[PDB]
PDB file of all heavy atoms in Angstrom:
ATOM      1  N   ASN A 365       8.854   6.557  11.454  1.00  0.00           N
ATOM      2  CA  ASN A 365       8.023   5.630  12.158  1.00  0.00           C
ATOM      3  C   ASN A 365       6.868   5.100  11.296  1.00  0.00           C
ATOM      4  O   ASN A 365       5.966   4.393  11.851  1.00  0.00           O
ATOM      5  CB  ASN A 365       7.433   6.282  13.430  1.00  0.00           C
ATOM      6  CG  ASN A 365       6.490   7.426  13.172  1.00  0.00           C
ATOM      7  OD1 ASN A 365       6.084   7.742  12.026  1.00  0.00           O
ATOM      8  ND2 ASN A 365       6.106   8.130  14.286  1.00  0.00           N
ATOM      9  N   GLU A 366       6.847   5.354   9.976  1.00  0.00           N
ATOM     10  CA  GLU A 366       5.865   4.801   9.094  1.00  0.00           C
ATOM     11  C   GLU A 366       6.456   3.868   8.039  1.00  0.00           C
ATOM     12  O   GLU A 366       5.748   3.447   7.113  1.00  0.00           O
ATOM     13  CB  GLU A 366       5.091   5.925   8.466  1.00  0.00           C
ATOM     14  CG  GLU A 366       4.274   6.733   9.481  1.00  0.00           C
ATOM     15  CD  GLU A 366       3.297   7.722   8.859  1.00  0.00           C
ATOM     16  OE1 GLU A 366       3.588   8.384   7.872  1.00  0.00           O
ATOM     17  OE2 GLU A 366       2.147   7.776   9.366  1.00  0.00           O
ATOM     18  N   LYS A 367       7.717   3.521   8.181  1.00  0.00           N
ATOM     19  CA  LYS A 367       8.388   2.677   7.180  1.00  0.00           C
ATOM     20  C   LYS A 367       8.319   1.183   7.573  1.00  0.00           C
ATOM     21  O   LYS A 367       9.029   0.378   6.865  1.00  0.00           O
ATOM     22  CB  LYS A 367       9.838   3.105   7.043  1.00  0.00           C
ATOM     23  CG  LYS A 367      10.011   4.553   6.615  1.00  0.00           C
ATOM     24  CD  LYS A 367      11.507   4.944   6.541  1.00  0.00           C
ATOM     25  CE  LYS A 367      11.663   6.377   6.065  1.00  0.00           C
ATOM     26  NZ  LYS A 367      13.137   6.775   6.071  1.00  0.00           N
ATOM     27  N   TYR A 368       7.610   0.811   8.579  1.00  0.00           N
ATOM     28  CA  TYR A 368       7.606  -0.604   9.011  1.00  0.00           C
ATOM     29  C   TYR A 368       6.607  -1.484   8.239  1.00  0.00           C
ATOM     30  O   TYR A 368       5.701  -0.962   7.591  1.00  0.00           O
ATOM     31  CB  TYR A 368       7.379  -0.690  10.495  1.00  0.00           C
ATOM     32  CG  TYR A 368       5.983  -0.231  10.990  1.00  0.00           C
ATOM     33  CD1 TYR A 368       4.918  -1.144  10.997  1.00  0.00           C
ATOM     34  CD2 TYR A 368       5.775   1.024  11.541  1.00  0.00           C
ATOM     35  CE1 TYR A 368       3.650  -0.730  11.420  1.00  0.00           C
ATOM     36  CE2 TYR A 368       4.553   1.406  11.996  1.00  0.00           C
ATOM     37  CZ  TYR A 368       3.472   0.525  11.892  1.00  0.00           C
ATOM     38  OH  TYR A 368       2.183   0.908  12.399  1.00  0.00           O
ATOM     39  N   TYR A 369       6.839  -2.793   8.313  1.00  0.00           N
ATOM     40  CA  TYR A 369       5.923  -3.767   7.784  1.00  0.00           C
ATOM     41  C   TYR A 369       5.765  -4.868   8.806  1.00  0.00           C
ATOM     42  O   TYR A 369       6.729  -5.590   9.094  1.00  0.00           O
ATOM     43  CB  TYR A 369       6.472  -4.347   6.415  1.00  0.00           C
ATOM     44  CG  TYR A 369       5.631  -5.506   5.936  1.00  0.00           C
ATOM     45  CD1 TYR A 369       4.392  -5.308   5.361  1.00  0.00           C
ATOM     46  CD2 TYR A 369       6.107  -6.781   6.000  1.00  0.00           C
ATOM     47  CE1 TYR A 369       3.569  -6.363   4.986  1.00  0.00           C
ATOM     48  CE2 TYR A 369       5.315  -7.853   5.579  1.00  0.00           C
ATOM     49  CZ  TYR A 369       4.075  -7.616   5.052  1.00  0.00           C
ATOM     50  OH  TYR A 369       3.286  -8.689   4.600  1.00  0.00           O
ATOM     51  N   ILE A 370       4.533  -5.040   9.337  1.00  0.00           N
ATOM     52  CA  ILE A 370       4.335  -6.056  10.380  1.00  0.00           C
ATOM     53  C   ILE A 370       3.551  -7.235   9.864  1.00  0.00           C
ATOM     54  O   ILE A 370       2.543  -7.651  10.489  1.00  0.00           O
ATOM     55  CB  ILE A 370       3.708  -5.461  11.651  1.00  0.00           C
ATOM     56  CG1 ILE A 370       2.424  -4.649  11.422  1.00  0.00           C
ATOM     57  CG2 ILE A 370       4.729  -4.599  12.410  1.00  0.00           C
ATOM     58  CD1 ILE A 370       1.599  -4.426  12.680  1.00  0.00           C
ATOM     59  N   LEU A 371       3.993  -7.762   8.709  1.00  0.00           N
ATOM     60  CA  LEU A 371       3.423  -9.026   8.132  1.00  0.00           C
ATOM     61  C   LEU A 371       1.977  -8.866   7.697  1.00  0.00           C
ATOM     62  O   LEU A 371       1.249  -9.894   7.666  1.00  0.00           O
ATOM     63  CB  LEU A 371       3.626 -10.160   9.129  1.00  0.00           C
ATOM     64  CG  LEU A 371       5.061 -10.418   9.587  1.00  0.00           C
ATOM     65  CD1 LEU A 371       5.113 -11.524  10.634  1.00  0.00           C
ATOM     66  CD2 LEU A 371       5.956 -10.799   8.348  1.00  0.00           C
ATOM     67  N   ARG A 372       1.587  -7.660   7.405  1.00  0.00           N
ATOM     68  CA  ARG A 372       0.163  -7.375   7.171  1.00  0.00           C
ATOM     69  C   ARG A 372      -0.353  -8.006   5.866  1.00  0.00           C
ATOM     70  O   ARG A 372       0.432  -8.183   4.921  1.00  0.00           O
ATOM     71  CB  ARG A 372      -0.083  -5.906   7.144  1.00  0.00           C
ATOM     72  CG  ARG A 372      -0.053  -5.180   8.439  1.00  0.00           C
ATOM     73  CD  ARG A 372      -0.870  -3.926   8.316  1.00  0.00           C
ATOM     74  NE  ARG A 372      -0.610  -2.913   9.323  1.00  0.00           N
ATOM     75  CZ  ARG A 372      -1.106  -2.914  10.524  1.00  0.00           C
ATOM     76  NH1 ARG A 372      -1.956  -3.878  10.913  1.00  0.00           N
ATOM     77  NH2 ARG A 372      -0.873  -1.944  11.378  1.00  0.00           N
ATOM     78  N   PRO A 373      -1.681  -8.319   5.822  1.00  0.00           N
ATOM     79  CA  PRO A 373      -2.232  -9.064   4.667  1.00  0.00           C
ATOM     80  C   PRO A 373      -2.961  -8.256   3.549  1.00  0.00           C
ATOM     81  O   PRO A 373      -3.293  -8.796   2.538  1.00  0.00           O
ATOM     82  CB  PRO A 373      -3.273  -9.938   5.323  1.00  0.00           C
ATOM     83  CG  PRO A 373      -3.834  -9.066   6.419  1.00  0.00           C
ATOM     84  CD  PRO A 373      -2.568  -8.371   6.969  1.00  0.00           C
ATOM     85  N   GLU A 374      -3.132  -6.929   3.798  1.00  0.00           N
ATOM     86  CA  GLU A 374      -4.205  -6.238   3.029  1.00  0.00           C
ATOM     87  C   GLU A 374      -3.913  -6.148   1.527  1.00  0.00           C
ATOM     88  O   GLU A 374      -4.822  -6.105   0.718  1.00  0.00           O
ATOM     89  CB  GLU A 374      -4.466  -4.820   3.555  1.00  0.00           C
ATOM     90  CG  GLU A 374      -5.067  -4.787   4.962  1.00  0.00           C
ATOM     91  CD  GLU A 374      -4.099  -5.024   6.049  1.00  0.00           C
ATOM     92  OE1 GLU A 374      -2.822  -4.883   5.747  1.00  0.00           O
ATOM     93  OE2 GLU A 374      -4.472  -5.367   7.168  1.00  0.00           O
ATOM     94  N   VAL A 375      -2.632  -6.059   1.156  1.00  0.00           N
ATOM     95  CA  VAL A 375      -2.321  -5.938  -0.280  1.00  0.00           C
ATOM     96  C   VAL A 375      -2.524  -7.285  -0.944  1.00  0.00           C
ATOM     97  O   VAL A 375      -3.057  -7.409  -2.028  1.00  0.00           O
ATOM     98  CB  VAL A 375      -0.910  -5.386  -0.474  1.00  0.00           C
ATOM     99  CG1 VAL A 375      -0.503  -5.465  -1.905  1.00  0.00           C
ATOM    100  CG2 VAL A 375      -0.863  -3.889  -0.014  1.00  0.00           C
ATOM    101  N   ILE A 376      -2.114  -8.353  -0.260  1.00  0.00           N
ATOM    102  CA  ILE A 376      -2.306  -9.697  -0.790  1.00  0.00           C
ATOM    103  C   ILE A 376      -3.749 -10.041  -0.819  1.00  0.00           C
ATOM    104  O   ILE A 376      -4.263 -10.690  -1.766  1.00  0.00           O
ATOM    105  CB  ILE A 376      -1.472 -10.683   0.039  1.00  0.00           C
ATOM    106  CG1 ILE A 376       0.034 -10.543  -0.288  1.00  0.00           C
ATOM    107  CG2 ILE A 376      -1.887 -12.146  -0.295  1.00  0.00           C
ATOM    108  CD1 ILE A 376       0.933 -11.233   0.703  1.00  0.00           C
ATOM    109  N   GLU A 377      -4.541  -9.588   0.197  1.00  0.00           N
ATOM    110  CA  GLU A 377      -5.971  -9.733   0.237  1.00  0.00           C
ATOM    111  C   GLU A 377      -6.595  -9.124  -1.038  1.00  0.00           C
ATOM    112  O   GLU A 377      -7.377  -9.772  -1.681  1.00  0.00           O
ATOM    113  CB  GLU A 377      -6.496  -9.067   1.486  1.00  0.00           C
ATOM    114  CG  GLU A 377      -8.044  -9.059   1.647  1.00  0.00           C
ATOM    115  CD  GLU A 377      -8.493  -8.270   2.866  1.00  0.00           C
ATOM    116  OE1 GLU A 377      -7.609  -7.759   3.608  1.00  0.00           O
ATOM    117  OE2 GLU A 377      -9.710  -8.180   3.084  1.00  0.00           O
ATOM    118  N   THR A 378      -6.176  -7.887  -1.405  1.00  0.00           N
ATOM    119  CA  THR A 378      -6.670  -7.297  -2.553  1.00  0.00           C
ATOM    120  C   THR A 378      -6.212  -8.024  -3.855  1.00  0.00           C
ATOM    121  O   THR A 378      -7.066  -8.197  -4.783  1.00  0.00           O
ATOM    122  CB  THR A 378      -6.208  -5.788  -2.599  1.00  0.00           C
ATOM    123  OG1 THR A 378      -7.064  -5.082  -1.694  1.00  0.00           O
ATOM    124  CG2 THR A 378      -6.360  -5.192  -3.987  1.00  0.00           C
ATOM    125  N   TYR A 379      -5.026  -8.511  -3.866  1.00  0.00           N
ATOM    126  CA  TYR A 379      -4.539  -9.329  -5.015  1.00  0.00           C
ATOM    127  C   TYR A 379      -5.510 -10.524  -5.194  1.00  0.00           C
ATOM    128  O   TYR A 379      -5.752 -10.954  -6.351  1.00  0.00           O
ATOM    129  CB  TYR A 379      -3.107  -9.822  -4.897  1.00  0.00           C
ATOM    130  CG  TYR A 379      -2.028  -8.806  -4.888  1.00  0.00           C
ATOM    131  CD1 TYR A 379      -0.751  -9.163  -4.427  1.00  0.00           C
ATOM    132  CD2 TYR A 379      -2.235  -7.502  -5.304  1.00  0.00           C
ATOM    133  CE1 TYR A 379       0.265  -8.250  -4.470  1.00  0.00           C
ATOM    134  CE2 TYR A 379      -1.205  -6.574  -5.349  1.00  0.00           C
ATOM    135  CZ  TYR A 379       0.048  -6.960  -4.888  1.00  0.00           C
ATOM    136  OH  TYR A 379       1.119  -6.018  -4.895  1.00  0.00           O
ATOM    137  N   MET A 380      -5.906 -11.167  -4.121  1.00  0.00           N
ATOM    138  CA  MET A 380      -6.698 -12.374  -4.210  1.00  0.00           C
ATOM    139  C   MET A 380      -8.060 -12.102  -4.839  1.00  0.00           C
ATOM    140  O   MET A 380      -8.525 -12.804  -5.707  1.00  0.00           O
ATOM    141  CB  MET A 380      -6.856 -13.052  -2.797  1.00  0.00           C
ATOM    142  CG  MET A 380      -7.687 -14.293  -2.777  1.00  0.00           C
ATOM    143  SD  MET A 380      -9.438 -14.151  -2.782  1.00  0.00           S
ATOM    144  CE  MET A 380      -9.686 -13.261  -1.125  1.00  0.00           C
ATOM    145  N   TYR A 381      -8.717 -11.045  -4.355  1.00  0.00           N
ATOM    146  CA  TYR A 381     -10.034 -10.667  -4.968  1.00  0.00           C
ATOM    147  C   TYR A 381      -9.850 -10.303  -6.394  1.00  0.00           C
ATOM    148  O   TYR A 381     -10.655 -10.663  -7.263  1.00  0.00           O
ATOM    149  CB  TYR A 381     -10.649  -9.516  -4.218  1.00  0.00           C
ATOM    150  CG  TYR A 381     -11.222  -9.957  -2.867  1.00  0.00           C
ATOM    151  CD1 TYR A 381     -10.565  -9.641  -1.659  1.00  0.00           C
ATOM    152  CD2 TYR A 381     -12.451 -10.617  -2.815  1.00  0.00           C
ATOM    153  CE1 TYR A 381     -11.112  -9.986  -0.435  1.00  0.00           C
ATOM    154  CE2 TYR A 381     -13.003 -11.031  -1.600  1.00  0.00           C
ATOM    155  CZ  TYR A 381     -12.302 -10.725  -0.359  1.00  0.00           C
ATOM    156  OH  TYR A 381     -12.802 -11.094   0.836  1.00  0.00           O
ATOM    157  N   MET A 382      -8.764  -9.536  -6.724  1.00  0.00           N
ATOM    158  CA  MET A 382      -8.594  -9.100  -8.142  1.00  0.00           C
ATOM    159  C   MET A 382      -8.340 -10.327  -8.996  1.00  0.00           C
ATOM    160  O   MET A 382      -8.862 -10.383 -10.150  1.00  0.00           O
ATOM    161  CB  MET A 382      -7.473  -8.116  -8.255  1.00  0.00           C
ATOM    162  CG  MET A 382      -7.791  -6.718  -7.591  1.00  0.00           C
ATOM    163  SD  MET A 382      -9.360  -5.950  -8.051  1.00  0.00           S
ATOM    164  CE  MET A 382      -9.251  -5.822  -9.818  1.00  0.00           C
ATOM    165  N   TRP A 383      -7.516 -11.282  -8.564  1.00  0.00           N
ATOM    166  CA  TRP A 383      -7.295 -12.528  -9.314  1.00  0.00           C
ATOM    167  C   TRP A 383      -8.598 -13.286  -9.503  1.00  0.00           C
ATOM    168  O   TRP A 383      -8.925 -13.737 -10.622  1.00  0.00           O
ATOM    169  CB  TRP A 383      -6.290 -13.393  -8.605  1.00  0.00           C
ATOM    170  CG  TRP A 383      -6.285 -14.762  -9.199  1.00  0.00           C
ATOM    171  CD1 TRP A 383      -6.740 -15.899  -8.551  1.00  0.00           C
ATOM    172  CD2 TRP A 383      -5.867 -15.139 -10.493  1.00  0.00           C
ATOM    173  NE1 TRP A 383      -6.612 -16.952  -9.464  1.00  0.00           N
ATOM    174  CE2 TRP A 383      -6.074 -16.533 -10.661  1.00  0.00           C
ATOM    175  CE3 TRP A 383      -5.303 -14.441 -11.568  1.00  0.00           C
ATOM    176  CZ2 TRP A 383      -5.743 -17.277 -11.844  1.00  0.00           C
ATOM    177  CZ3 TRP A 383      -5.002 -15.163 -12.736  1.00  0.00           C
ATOM    178  CH2 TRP A 383      -5.237 -16.541 -12.858  1.00  0.00           C
ATOM    179  N   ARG A 384      -9.399 -13.436  -8.439  1.00  0.00           N
ATOM    180  CA  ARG A 384     -10.603 -14.266  -8.587  1.00  0.00           C
ATOM    181  C   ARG A 384     -11.665 -13.602  -9.397  1.00  0.00           C
ATOM    182  O   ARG A 384     -12.447 -14.303 -10.065  1.00  0.00           O
ATOM    183  CB  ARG A 384     -11.113 -14.647  -7.194  1.00  0.00           C
ATOM    184  CG  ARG A 384     -10.306 -15.721  -6.543  1.00  0.00           C
ATOM    185  CD  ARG A 384     -10.875 -16.351  -5.361  1.00  0.00           C
ATOM    186  NE  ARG A 384     -10.219 -17.589  -5.086  1.00  0.00           N
ATOM    187  CZ  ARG A 384     -10.607 -18.523  -4.225  1.00  0.00           C
ATOM    188  NH1 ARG A 384     -11.683 -18.268  -3.480  1.00  0.00           N
ATOM    189  NH2 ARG A 384      -9.908 -19.665  -4.064  1.00  0.00           N
ATOM    190  N   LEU A 385     -11.708 -12.232  -9.426  1.00  0.00           N
ATOM    191  CA  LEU A 385     -12.694 -11.504 -10.157  1.00  0.00           C
ATOM    192  C   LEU A 385     -12.261 -11.051 -11.552  1.00  0.00           C
ATOM    193  O   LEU A 385     -13.062 -10.536 -12.272  1.00  0.00           O
ATOM    194  CB  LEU A 385     -13.214 -10.351  -9.333  1.00  0.00           C
ATOM    195  CG  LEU A 385     -13.875 -10.718  -8.023  1.00  0.00           C
ATOM    196  CD1 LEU A 385     -14.111  -9.467  -7.180  1.00  0.00           C
ATOM    197  CD2 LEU A 385     -15.170 -11.484  -8.258  1.00  0.00           C
ATOM    198  N   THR A 386     -10.937 -11.184 -11.917  1.00  0.00           N
ATOM    199  CA  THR A 386     -10.547 -10.744 -13.268  1.00  0.00           C
ATOM    200  C   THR A 386      -9.720 -11.864 -13.938  1.00  0.00           C
ATOM    201  O   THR A 386      -9.723 -11.909 -15.190  1.00  0.00           O
ATOM    202  CB  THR A 386      -9.673  -9.499 -13.207  1.00  0.00           C
ATOM    203  OG1 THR A 386      -8.385  -9.790 -12.622  1.00  0.00           O
ATOM    204  CG2 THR A 386     -10.350  -8.401 -12.425  1.00  0.00           C
ATOM    205  N   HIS A 387      -9.034 -12.694 -13.165  1.00  0.00           N
ATOM    206  CA  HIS A 387      -8.079 -13.688 -13.683  1.00  0.00           C
ATOM    207  C   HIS A 387      -7.001 -13.039 -14.528  1.00  0.00           C
ATOM    208  O   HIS A 387      -6.471 -13.686 -15.443  1.00  0.00           O
ATOM    209  CB  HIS A 387      -8.826 -14.824 -14.434  1.00  0.00           C
ATOM    210  CG  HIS A 387      -9.617 -15.722 -13.505  1.00  0.00           C
ATOM    211  ND1 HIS A 387     -10.915 -15.487 -13.172  1.00  0.00           N
ATOM    212  CD2 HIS A 387      -9.184 -16.780 -12.765  1.00  0.00           C
ATOM    213  CE1 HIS A 387     -11.287 -16.398 -12.330  1.00  0.00           C
ATOM    214  NE2 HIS A 387     -10.299 -17.204 -12.084  1.00  0.00           N
ATOM    215  N   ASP A 388      -6.675 -11.806 -14.283  1.00  0.00           N
ATOM    216  CA  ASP A 388      -5.535 -11.185 -14.868  1.00  0.00           C
ATOM    217  C   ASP A 388      -4.261 -11.737 -14.202  1.00  0.00           C
ATOM    218  O   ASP A 388      -4.126 -11.627 -12.972  1.00  0.00           O
ATOM    219  CB  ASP A 388      -5.579  -9.623 -14.696  1.00  0.00           C
ATOM    220  CG  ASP A 388      -4.537  -8.907 -15.457  1.00  0.00           C
ATOM    221  OD1 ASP A 388      -3.383  -9.391 -15.542  1.00  0.00           O
ATOM    222  OD2 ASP A 388      -4.813  -7.770 -15.962  1.00  0.00           O
ATOM    223  N   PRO A 389      -3.338 -12.390 -15.035  1.00  0.00           N
ATOM    224  CA  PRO A 389      -2.203 -13.061 -14.360  1.00  0.00           C
ATOM    225  C   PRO A 389      -1.317 -12.168 -13.585  1.00  0.00           C
ATOM    226  O   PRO A 389      -0.522 -12.730 -12.730  1.00  0.00           O
ATOM    227  CB  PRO A 389      -1.535 -13.719 -15.555  1.00  0.00           C
ATOM    228  CG  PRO A 389      -2.539 -13.746 -16.678  1.00  0.00           C
ATOM    229  CD  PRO A 389      -3.356 -12.494 -16.457  1.00  0.00           C
ATOM    230  N   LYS A 390      -1.314 -10.881 -13.855  1.00  0.00           N
ATOM    231  CA  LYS A 390      -0.425  -9.951 -13.111  1.00  0.00           C
ATOM    232  C   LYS A 390      -0.673 -10.019 -11.605  1.00  0.00           C
ATOM    233  O   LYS A 390       0.224  -9.777 -10.796  1.00  0.00           O
ATOM    234  CB  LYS A 390      -0.537  -8.574 -13.656  1.00  0.00           C
ATOM    235  CG  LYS A 390      -1.767  -7.760 -13.209  1.00  0.00           C
ATOM    236  CD  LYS A 390      -1.802  -6.406 -13.925  1.00  0.00           C
ATOM    237  CE  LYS A 390      -3.018  -5.592 -13.524  1.00  0.00           C
ATOM    238  NZ  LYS A 390      -3.027  -4.303 -14.368  1.00  0.00           N
ATOM    239  N   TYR A 391      -1.938 -10.361 -11.181  1.00  0.00           N
ATOM    240  CA  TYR A 391      -2.185 -10.417  -9.759  1.00  0.00           C
ATOM    241  C   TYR A 391      -1.479 -11.626  -9.086  1.00  0.00           C
ATOM    242  O   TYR A 391      -0.959 -11.533  -7.977  1.00  0.00           O
ATOM    243  CB  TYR A 391      -3.696 -10.487  -9.478  1.00  0.00           C
ATOM    244  CG  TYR A 391      -4.300  -9.173  -9.963  1.00  0.00           C
ATOM    245  CD1 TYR A 391      -5.250  -9.157 -10.985  1.00  0.00           C
ATOM    246  CD2 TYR A 391      -3.916  -7.984  -9.388  1.00  0.00           C
ATOM    247  CE1 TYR A 391      -5.766  -7.946 -11.436  1.00  0.00           C
ATOM    248  CE2 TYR A 391      -4.454  -6.792  -9.831  1.00  0.00           C
ATOM    249  CZ  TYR A 391      -5.380  -6.787 -10.857  1.00  0.00           C
ATOM    250  OH  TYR A 391      -5.936  -5.590 -11.299  1.00  0.00           O
ATOM    251  N   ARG A 392      -1.315 -12.736  -9.834  1.00  0.00           N
ATOM    252  CA  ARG A 392      -0.465 -13.830  -9.371  1.00  0.00           C
ATOM    253  C   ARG A 392       0.967 -13.462  -9.427  1.00  0.00           C
ATOM    254  O   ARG A 392       1.794 -13.841  -8.538  1.00  0.00           O
ATOM    255  CB  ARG A 392      -0.785 -15.105 -10.181  1.00  0.00           C
ATOM    256  CG  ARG A 392      -1.936 -15.938  -9.613  1.00  0.00           C
ATOM    257  CD  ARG A 392      -2.260 -17.167 -10.463  1.00  0.00           C
ATOM    258  NE  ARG A 392      -3.136 -18.050  -9.723  1.00  0.00           N
ATOM    259  CZ  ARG A 392      -3.623 -19.180 -10.154  1.00  0.00           C
ATOM    260  NH1 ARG A 392      -3.344 -19.612 -11.360  1.00  0.00           N
ATOM    261  NH2 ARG A 392      -4.412 -19.936  -9.395  1.00  0.00           N
ATOM    262  N   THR A 393       1.389 -12.731 -10.476  1.00  0.00           N
ATOM    263  CA  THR A 393       2.757 -12.254 -10.572  1.00  0.00           C
ATOM    264  C   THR A 393       3.135 -11.387  -9.332  1.00  0.00           C
ATOM    265  O   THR A 393       4.148 -11.576  -8.671  1.00  0.00           O
ATOM    266  CB  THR A 393       3.024 -11.555 -11.877  1.00  0.00           C
ATOM    267  OG1 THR A 393       2.797 -12.438 -12.925  1.00  0.00           O
ATOM    268  CG2 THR A 393       4.441 -11.046 -11.914  1.00  0.00           C
ATOM    269  N   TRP A 394       2.249 -10.417  -9.034  1.00  0.00           N
ATOM    270  CA  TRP A 394       2.487  -9.543  -7.915  1.00  0.00           C
ATOM    271  C   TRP A 394       2.467 -10.263  -6.594  1.00  0.00           C
ATOM    272  O   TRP A 394       3.231  -9.942  -5.671  1.00  0.00           O
ATOM    273  CB  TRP A 394       1.472  -8.388  -7.904  1.00  0.00           C
ATOM    274  CG  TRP A 394       1.572  -7.482  -9.123  1.00  0.00           C
ATOM    275  CD1 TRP A 394       2.474  -7.541 -10.080  1.00  0.00           C
ATOM    276  CD2 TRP A 394       0.625  -6.446  -9.467  1.00  0.00           C
ATOM    277  NE1 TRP A 394       2.230  -6.583 -11.067  1.00  0.00           N
ATOM    278  CE2 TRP A 394       1.113  -5.916 -10.701  1.00  0.00           C
ATOM    279  CE3 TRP A 394      -0.504  -5.912  -8.853  1.00  0.00           C
ATOM    280  CZ2 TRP A 394       0.441  -4.816 -11.341  1.00  0.00           C
ATOM    281  CZ3 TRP A 394      -1.137  -4.837  -9.508  1.00  0.00           C
ATOM    282  CH2 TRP A 394      -0.673  -4.325 -10.727  1.00  0.00           C
ATOM    283  N   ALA A 395       1.557 -11.249  -6.405  1.00  0.00           N
ATOM    284  CA  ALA A 395       1.510 -12.028  -5.174  1.00  0.00           C
ATOM    285  C   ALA A 395       2.821 -12.814  -5.037  1.00  0.00           C
ATOM    286  O   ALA A 395       3.317 -12.845  -3.921  1.00  0.00           O
ATOM    287  CB  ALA A 395       0.334 -12.972  -5.194  1.00  0.00           C
ATOM    288  N   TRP A 396       3.331 -13.374  -6.047  1.00  0.00           N
ATOM    289  CA  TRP A 396       4.585 -14.112  -5.976  1.00  0.00           C
ATOM    290  C   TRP A 396       5.816 -13.201  -5.614  1.00  0.00           C
ATOM    291  O   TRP A 396       6.684 -13.605  -4.891  1.00  0.00           O
ATOM    292  CB  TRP A 396       4.906 -14.930  -7.291  1.00  0.00           C
ATOM    293  CG  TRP A 396       6.025 -15.906  -7.012  1.00  0.00           C
ATOM    294  CD1 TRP A 396       7.256 -15.851  -7.576  1.00  0.00           C
ATOM    295  CD2 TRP A 396       5.959 -17.052  -6.134  1.00  0.00           C
ATOM    296  NE1 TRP A 396       8.001 -16.940  -7.143  1.00  0.00           N
ATOM    297  CE2 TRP A 396       7.263 -17.658  -6.223  1.00  0.00           C
ATOM    298  CE3 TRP A 396       5.011 -17.606  -5.298  1.00  0.00           C
ATOM    299  CZ2 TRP A 396       7.541 -18.794  -5.496  1.00  0.00           C
ATOM    300  CZ3 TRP A 396       5.327 -18.764  -4.589  1.00  0.00           C
ATOM    301  CH2 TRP A 396       6.558 -19.332  -4.730  1.00  0.00           C
ATOM    302  N   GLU A 397       5.826 -11.976  -6.140  1.00  0.00           N
ATOM    303  CA  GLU A 397       6.849 -11.019  -5.743  1.00  0.00           C
ATOM    304  C   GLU A 397       6.838 -10.827  -4.225  1.00  0.00           C
ATOM    305  O   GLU A 397       7.882 -10.788  -3.613  1.00  0.00           O
ATOM    306  CB  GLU A 397       6.684  -9.698  -6.428  1.00  0.00           C
ATOM    307  CG  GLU A 397       6.851  -9.691  -7.899  1.00  0.00           C
ATOM    308  CD  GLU A 397       6.366  -8.419  -8.636  1.00  0.00           C
ATOM    309  OE1 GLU A 397       6.029  -7.478  -7.907  1.00  0.00           O
ATOM    310  OE2 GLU A 397       6.373  -8.360  -9.865  1.00  0.00           O
ATOM    311  N   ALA A 398       5.650 -10.718  -3.606  1.00  0.00           N
ATOM    312  CA  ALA A 398       5.512 -10.636  -2.162  1.00  0.00           C
ATOM    313  C   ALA A 398       6.026 -11.875  -1.452  1.00  0.00           C
ATOM    314  O   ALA A 398       6.680 -11.811  -0.403  1.00  0.00           O
ATOM    315  CB  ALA A 398       4.091 -10.313  -1.763  1.00  0.00           C
ATOM    316  N   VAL A 399       5.681 -13.063  -2.000  1.00  0.00           N
ATOM    317  CA  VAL A 399       6.220 -14.267  -1.443  1.00  0.00           C
ATOM    318  C   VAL A 399       7.731 -14.253  -1.413  1.00  0.00           C
ATOM    319  O   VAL A 399       8.383 -14.569  -0.355  1.00  0.00           O
ATOM    320  CB  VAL A 399       5.726 -15.503  -2.261  1.00  0.00           C
ATOM    321  CG1 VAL A 399       6.445 -16.749  -1.776  1.00  0.00           C
ATOM    322  CG2 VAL A 399       4.245 -15.656  -2.121  1.00  0.00           C
TER     323      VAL A 399
END
Side-chain angles (χ1 to χ4, degrees):
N365 66 8
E366 297 192 316
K367 301 179 178 176
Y368 65 84
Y369 172 73
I370 51 163
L371 304 175
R372 285 203 199 278
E374 291 79 19
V375 172
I376 288 165
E377 176 184 359
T378 283
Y379 294 166
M380 183 276 297
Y381 285 105
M382 291 311 301
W383 166 252
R384 284 192 162 190
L385 297 172
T386 71
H387 290 89
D388 188 324
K390 77 185 179 184
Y391 296 115
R392 272 177 168 179
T393 299
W394 297 353
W396 191 249
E397 294 168 8
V399 172

